[PDB]
Amino acid sequence: VTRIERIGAHSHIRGLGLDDALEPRQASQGMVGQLAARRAAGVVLEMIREGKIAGRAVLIAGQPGTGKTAIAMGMAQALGPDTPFTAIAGSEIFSLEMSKTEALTQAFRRSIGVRIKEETEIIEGEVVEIQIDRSKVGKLTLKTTEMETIYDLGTKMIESLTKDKVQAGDVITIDKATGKISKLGRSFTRARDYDAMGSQTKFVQCPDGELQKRKEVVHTVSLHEIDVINSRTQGFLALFSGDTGEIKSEVREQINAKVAEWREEGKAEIIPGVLFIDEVHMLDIESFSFLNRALESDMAPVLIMATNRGITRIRGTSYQSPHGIPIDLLDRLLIVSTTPYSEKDTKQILRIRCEEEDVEMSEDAYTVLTRIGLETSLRYAIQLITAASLVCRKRKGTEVQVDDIKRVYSLFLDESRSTQYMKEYQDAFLFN
Amino acid sequence: VTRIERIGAHSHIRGLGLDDALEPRQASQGMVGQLAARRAAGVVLEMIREGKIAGRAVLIAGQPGTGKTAIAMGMAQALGPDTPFTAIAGSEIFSLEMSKTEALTQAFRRSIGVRIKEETEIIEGEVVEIQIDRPATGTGSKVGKLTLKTTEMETIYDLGTKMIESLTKDKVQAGDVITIDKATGKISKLGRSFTRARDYDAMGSQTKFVQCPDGELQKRKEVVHTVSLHEIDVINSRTQGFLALFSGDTGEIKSEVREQINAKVAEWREEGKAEIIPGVLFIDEVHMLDIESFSFLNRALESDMAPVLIMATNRGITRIRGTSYQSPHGIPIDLLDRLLIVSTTPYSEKDTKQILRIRCEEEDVEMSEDAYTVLTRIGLETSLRYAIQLITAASLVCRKRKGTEVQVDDIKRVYSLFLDESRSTQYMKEYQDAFLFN
Amino acid sequence: QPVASPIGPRSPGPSHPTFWTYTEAAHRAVLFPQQRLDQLSEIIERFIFVMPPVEAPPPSLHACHPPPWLAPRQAAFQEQLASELWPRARPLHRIV
Amino acid sequence: ITPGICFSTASLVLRATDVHPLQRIDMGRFDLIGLEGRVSRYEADTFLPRHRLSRRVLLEVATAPDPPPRPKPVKM
Amino acid sequence: QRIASHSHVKGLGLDESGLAKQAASGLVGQENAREACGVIVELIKSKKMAGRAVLLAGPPGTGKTALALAIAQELGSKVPFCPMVGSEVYSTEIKKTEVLMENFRRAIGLRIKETKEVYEGEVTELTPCEISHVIIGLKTAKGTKQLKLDPSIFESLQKERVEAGDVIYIEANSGAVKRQGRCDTYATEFDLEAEEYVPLPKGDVHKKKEIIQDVTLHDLDVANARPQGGQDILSMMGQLMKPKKTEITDKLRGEINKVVNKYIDQGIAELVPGVLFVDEVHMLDIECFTYLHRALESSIAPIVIFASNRGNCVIRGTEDITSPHGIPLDLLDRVMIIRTMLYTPQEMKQIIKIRAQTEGINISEEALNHLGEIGTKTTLRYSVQLLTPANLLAKINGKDSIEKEHVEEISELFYDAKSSAKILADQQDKYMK
Amino acid sequence: TQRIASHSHVKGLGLDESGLAKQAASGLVGQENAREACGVIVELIKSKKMAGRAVLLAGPPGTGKTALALAIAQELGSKVPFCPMVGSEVYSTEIKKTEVLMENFRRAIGLRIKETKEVYEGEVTELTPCETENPMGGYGKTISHVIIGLKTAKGTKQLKLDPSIFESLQKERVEAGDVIYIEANSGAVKRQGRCDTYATEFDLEAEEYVPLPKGDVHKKKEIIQDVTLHDLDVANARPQGGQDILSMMGQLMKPKKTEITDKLRGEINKVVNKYIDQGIAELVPGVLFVDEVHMLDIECFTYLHRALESSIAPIVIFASNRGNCVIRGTEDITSPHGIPLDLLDRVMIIRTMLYTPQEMKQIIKIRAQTEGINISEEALNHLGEIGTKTTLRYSVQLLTPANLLAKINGKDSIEKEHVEEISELFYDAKSSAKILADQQDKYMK
């Protein structure tokens, strides 16, 4: 069937294709070439996995189409889902709700995972009888498939039971430490054959075993989530809406201290992760200035960045800098350069894309498509793969031939041909 | 112990230092030199104290470090806490919560104080015996009796239910010196004339006692309530306005509210209920205002509720913010016509030395005559503020070497350790490529 | 609930470390809105006078045959909100 | 004091957003934010996977006769 | 009373034929401008035309704002006069066009007859009647009456802590319950009760009073856009959660127009079209001017007076479009331009003398001539502002009148704009920027 | 704390007792003059008698400006407030820039409050009124004390209290066997539950049963609480804990920074002065560090003049690596550090110089020691040569990749080959710029 995840621009990438020595294979896990860049990415990935050093910045630089985002996706795939990997674009920090520095702080704190581990004693059973005398004192009877006992209730327990409208046949759990009651469901009897059911009622089997049980919950949350939870009374709602605003720095410091306390007590573990900012040249000079000192914290993840700009203008200034990034930030980061692909690498990438899309192409078609990709661009050839597959299927064919590739080359234009055709009719277009 | 207020830039300025004829002394109340500017400031201060002419504007213009802010602080210290003095910077009117005109209106209205004077009957005495009888169960009428004492009186009062409740809430006991306002029934405890019984436990360490009040029990005292026009505007804008007095968050106050308040305050002034205490608004670095703000200032000074406006700027012929127009002081010529300008001349050598001496006296720093000469030379060569900073720098260097008097060697040491703008710029030119953007 | 404040949370007793962390002096330097109202009672009585020139009830939506559930639902919502919030608005009585 | 504004509109306008239940799907199957503060990780992860009802158990309980009356407590 | 910059302006100083007297009502010159302003005043008093715009044009110090305030003084306090500065449209809450529209409606006033129903008396019985109504008994010096009131009034009475024996005031129109005090007859029962006593009302329990209310269209718009008359929980919620101004729709203004027309037809309302005054019109931008086109073309709009001292200046909001007064030529076609002229030295001396009399200052003839000469150079504004400092100097020296020496001393102490410009030019390297 | 950041090796300024700077101490190498000046500034901060004094750290990038500021913070200690801040942070979507600057100023001024909390703990064993043999008024019974017996783990004491506590005892529903605590400073009784010794395994109450208190019945301790003026300002501007409709609105509405008024700040100053005079509190003026001050605009710089001239302001440390740059918010106005000359007249400038190769080698060795990395002498010399070209930050950033590469190769130390391979894998700014210039056509923009 068709799931929500479909064939994208990087669906063929499963990893960085390295061995135990971080030496890149020529074609492994969906990556071709870029040997030096892939080895550097693997070294950075080992640095991420160790987690000892905080606030390390790497910039993946190269010409368009040279595999920078491909390498970032390979790093993300090779890194486990346990370790956070926040991938944002440079434009996403320009928010109408929070400042650029606040957006970058939230992105930084989203890249650090906190795995919690809480062990709690609970009472779990089916309610048999609730008797309350008059509401000062009462008794509650709970049962399992192997047990049954009666409990003496106080004022607050009676109030909590009456507030939740707990009655016979309800399967509930009670926390011993706090006394909070949550209703799991109700038992099914012959008399509960309802014709209409409420939106929250559900029938469950009576629990087995012992009435007293231990509940162990292990979950991974980020620092930003803990910040949002403690920002306001119902701050967990902002984790859905996103209406977080600018969280106070004092709250963040309190949470850092509390998280350190949890880490000392054994109730939490820190998993520093990666923040990938793609197309960083969209960041303004203020954002770069904030990044300069944000990386210097002890709770800063690894910042992987990617730009394809030459010596260009920094946004918000009139200055020219080698990547659009001020030279002060560039001294804080290691640069991984991606080289242009050769004919063999282009053909291998086309083969991987065809295998990913389940398209059969002849060798002459592969040669023609590689020539087109070298002449125009690799992404144009990748798109022509699917275009030619569709055209071949239209004529009831099974393998894409050179005629299909030529047909889709004539139907769909790259940038160069379109620009030439526009220059032919320049006066027709608007605002030249 | 150090209070929240410490030695600042203008901590030595206690006033303008003028005589009865508004003639500036050479060195008095911290001010040194600036004779013409201090005399002009004194005339403006007399105009403020008279409080008869609304919307007068004065511009203090001069080179950096010539004492514009010193003169403003001297005026503020000579005015006293009775007259409002709102000092703001030009940058503060640019706010995301309100318009620039609204911020200027609030600043203007923070500089005018409304005072209400009324006489109330007040009972002040030492509690001898208090008895309160209440029903054991159910709603009932509490009955009580209170005895109050002074040095010359003692009266037993029959208490009502609400006074009983007030005394119960305040937990008034025997020996407590309490104040009772007959109208509102408010009770304020101001001390204990003697200790509580020793046999009781969990009572804490007993504090010092308060002497019993003398004179008659029920006196007549004058109560003075003073608020500014801005406070009235804020508390009248909305129900939650009183919290906006502390949180800001006033938004933009409706013009209807301000017109109603102006009318009511005028009515009170005619009816003798309240007196208006006009003050001063001091906008430091007024050149940060844009053309729209200056245009608002032009007409906001034409109201009878406007205070005296004092501006300071060190700009020459400069572009007006928000425009491409060059104007004197960065201020439009239409506003410059509505104001008198007070120029501050640079300081001489002896004035610089006297300023350094006053600063050393304020900082409790002892310095030698040779050190004073060297520091005055450095201040003339570099700037007055640099020498002022070197004062305490050399004090710390001298204290480090277990000394008592700041010598020339300490001044040279701090001159080497800390650089001025000129030497820093020279060293930056020497390494111009190492610095990032030029 | 009071995260990063001079006011400490409601410690159960001296057995909790939070009992011996916060001071009453810090507590007395923070004023609740009720304390602010008690502090400005004389100011509220003497300086709160501005009345709107006009006063109107909110606009009402009328249809000949409305959905018979909209009005009772709005009435119940208003009743519950009033029963929960009107006692909390009593301190603001003099201002209104 | 002024009377309020009486804004009159067509009665059909107030039913514009209304959709009959037989014409709309249940959106509670995608309700994630409604579970917060009401549903726990225990219920979702540990309890329900073990104690979900089956059709066989439901049919057995429905077809079986009523359970015998609960015995009265005895001080023993 | 404090003396402001225009405190001497009491009128236009026109005769019965409309001609301008030389010196009258605190005005010395601008005879042509004063006659034009008199014609504008008659136009405003006619209450026939809508959206007629006038531009006062001239150099600074030529009394444009003085002429606007003189028009206000001629009209009277009954006719609305809304003074706004062009810089005030740049609000952070509502759009500039909304600010302009609101200021337009503020200029139109409405005198409406209203009847107030009052229940005033000492409470003798407060019996709830199960939502619980209240049955209340009120007594005055003339009689006693029992009333049945809504549960909201009972809640208000509870909030006021009204109990048997308290003197209360109830307004039936607004449902506003005020507890005034415990009756004076009970002031002898205790010695310290913490109560404020009030005498028994000497009229009837139920009174009806007819009063005249002065309101504007903007007030009605605000009352119907941010309602607070229901006294329900929703009104409090809306006030607390939404305290900012909103962009009132044209639909609400049409409804308010219908209501006011109905009131006028019923004979209980009178319309006063009024005046809007924009002082620094050049501070408006091209969007404001374009909106003002349509706003002035409206048949509801008031008479708007504009002022400007700009020459051929770039219109705000445009890149480099330059127009004669900072006002685009399209709006200048819709205005009547009143031109103000520079003052002769004789007129300057007359204005200085008037200002001296207004400020309660005695000035000698020699001092007056010297100050007029000072005003010939520099400006008239600068010369007028030296009166109070010179008076203070004379008072310090024991003189009850200003002599020439005091004026010279003050002019030596205080510089003008031209002198300060000269100082800045001579020392450009020492001042910042 | 366990993770190693960029300034993890800075433990203070390596200053002798006479103020002279040692060549290498406390993690700092070189910068002797700047370190001595920073020591003088530390003495200024500790003297606590100066307000609004500003210091500008000026020098090329990577010269220890932030390291020097953090060394100052280390010298002061955790008692002294230290509020770091970058210039970009003043641009907020909620409050104006001047408000952000003022809030950071108030964050730098700290207050230390010392109080004694005296309490009486115990399980109520006895609750006996002390009647009087002569009843006042003739009828009924009059009581002069209420004896409360409090039992703890290691003692039992009886307290003869005021009769008025009878109402508090009934309101709290205190009975025998309940654990309560009474505060001396207030005279109030609080029932912290019932003793756990009377609870059976069949009970279901959660917060009702509490353990019998350990220690003595009478517990008194000195509570030291550290607060800042900004804490009091924020707690008073948006108060939390009320039961009125305004507090409920505050809880409901999204929190938002507001422009705190001078009235509230003046009230806070008065309260702080009252506490200081009473002896409850001691003022702790700290430091506000504003890194990248050049990112402030002309409005912020102008406001800083009034901010620094105040008598309540802290000691502000600035830092800027810019040359003759254009001030932000102005059109073509150039100043020596990106800072207008008016603000430069109010600051003391500390100059940081470039590092010699020997100092760079020392810093690299220190960073390698901090990161737990063993580096050979030849590898260290090669990395120092790499640091002579490129920059110092580039060399110190090659240590962990080279260590990882050595560990993969199976070696416990970094050799020269590892550093060479890492240098081949990763490019510095200058090499990347050379590549970009050589291929400017193939890159974008």
Ligand SMILES: Nc1ncnc2c1ncn2[C@@H]1O[C@H](COP(=O)(O)OP(=O)(O)O)[C@@H](O)[C@H]1O
């Ligand atoms: N080394 C590679 N191996 C496999 N696919 C690649 C490689 N490099 C690029 N691609 C593919 O080519 C396309 C463009 O590469 P991408 O990394 O997105 O360009 P850029 O580096 O400019 O972001 C993507 O579909 C990507 O999957």
Ligand SMILES: Nc1ncnc2c1ncn2[C@@H]1O[C@H](COP(=O)(O)OP(=O)(O)O)[C@@H](O)[C@H]1O
């Ligand atoms: N005449 C003076 N008397 C006393 N102190 C002065 C005088 N002039 C300047 N100072 C002091 O020297 C410093 C610089 O003066 P200041 O008024 O700040 O200059 P500006 O005109 O730039 O405001 C301040 O600390 C100020 O108190």
Ligand SMILES: Nc1ncnc2c1ncn2[C@@H]1O[C@H](COP(=O)(O)OP(=O)(O)O)[C@@H](O)[C@H]1O
């Ligand atoms: N004809 C006049 N007679 C008397 N006083 C005048 C006259 N014209 C102007 N003034 C006064 O001189 C000052 C400047 O006039 P103003 O109306 O402010 O000029 P502008 O046209 O710049 O607004 C004001 O105090 C005003 O009252």
Ligand SMILES: Nc1ncnc2c1ncn2[C@@H]1O[C@H](COP(=O)(O)OP(=O)(O)O)[C@@H](O)[C@H]1O
């Ligand atoms: N003299 C020094 N001693 C020890 N470490 C230093 C020294 N100078 C710089 N560093 C370190 O080198 C790195 C460069 O940062 P830094 O010098 O603070 O840059 P900047 O001065 O531009 O803020 C930091 O890790 C810093 O701790």
Ligand SMILES: [Mg+2]
């Ligand atoms: Mg990409």
Ligand SMILES: [Mg+2]
């Ligand atoms: Mg100054």
